[model samples]
Target: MSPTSILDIRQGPKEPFRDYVDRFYKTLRAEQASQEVKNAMTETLLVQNANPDCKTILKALGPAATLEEMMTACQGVGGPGHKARVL
Candidate 1:
């Protein structure tokens, strides 16, 4: 799979959070994405699935943000606010 192919991966509306991350992880491994590419793509995909407040958190974190941090801050990885944490 090409690096661009990672952009094609999106979380399904009803997918489980663990499943969503697992799929991305599998693809990342299969495609042999570099650490930089892995970090970038993972954060992109994570932000896309983040709750509405994601943008707020992103802004708050600024360019220093990482996917692990985003995952900790935002909730509802698959559906909008369906499983959002009380932040």
Candidate 2:
């Protein structure tokens, strides 16, 4: 793993947190391969950034839904521990 800082806990409620984590790890592994490989990973990460889970939720919920509301819905479905972090 290339390693990462503490991710914003808030992001979890709006995403398939584990899938996002897997993608992040994929980026890290590619990064560890070499600078060229790491640079290549940016393409994948960029695509993810462009089409974030929040956007998907908004597509379902509509523009009236705040990011906070979307997160709440996600957590409601995904559950509280779905976005947990251990110290």
Candidate 3:
């Protein structure tokens, strides 16, 4: 996939946090080699392109170790009625 593929992975309007992440990783695994660099890319992509609901969660959560953990946290709370986040 090209860089455009990654560029296209943003959260859709009305798209779930989990669903956006599904797309994020699908495109993320394309050509990158280092876990840290790819995770960094994932970080900025989510920051720059995520839904507010997910952004709120990260606002409180504040960080990541694995890409999986941050995605998992967002997915865990990705229910129908998203709202103000907590730590």
Model 3 Cα RMSD, Å?
8.4
Please report, as a residue range, the 10-residue window in candidate 2 with the lowest summed lDDT.
Answer: 38-47
Estimate the TM-score of every prediction: 0.30, 0.22, 0.32
lDDT against the true structure, each candidate: 0.43, 0.36, 0.45
Highest lDDT: which candidate?
3
Better of 2 and 3 by lDDT: 3
List RMSD in Å for every model shown: 9.6, 14.1, 8.4
What is candidate 1's TM-score against the reference? 0.30
For candidate 3, which ten residues in a row score worst on lDDT? 10-19
Q: Is candidate 2 or candidate 3 better by TM-score?
A: 3
lDDT of 1 by residue, 1-87 (tens): 555444476533122334354556555555443323234434333432335554444433344435355544554345344333433
lDDT of 1 at 14: 27
Q: Give the Å shift of residue 30 in candidate 3.
A: 1.7
Clashing pairs in 1: none
Give lDDT for model 1.
0.43
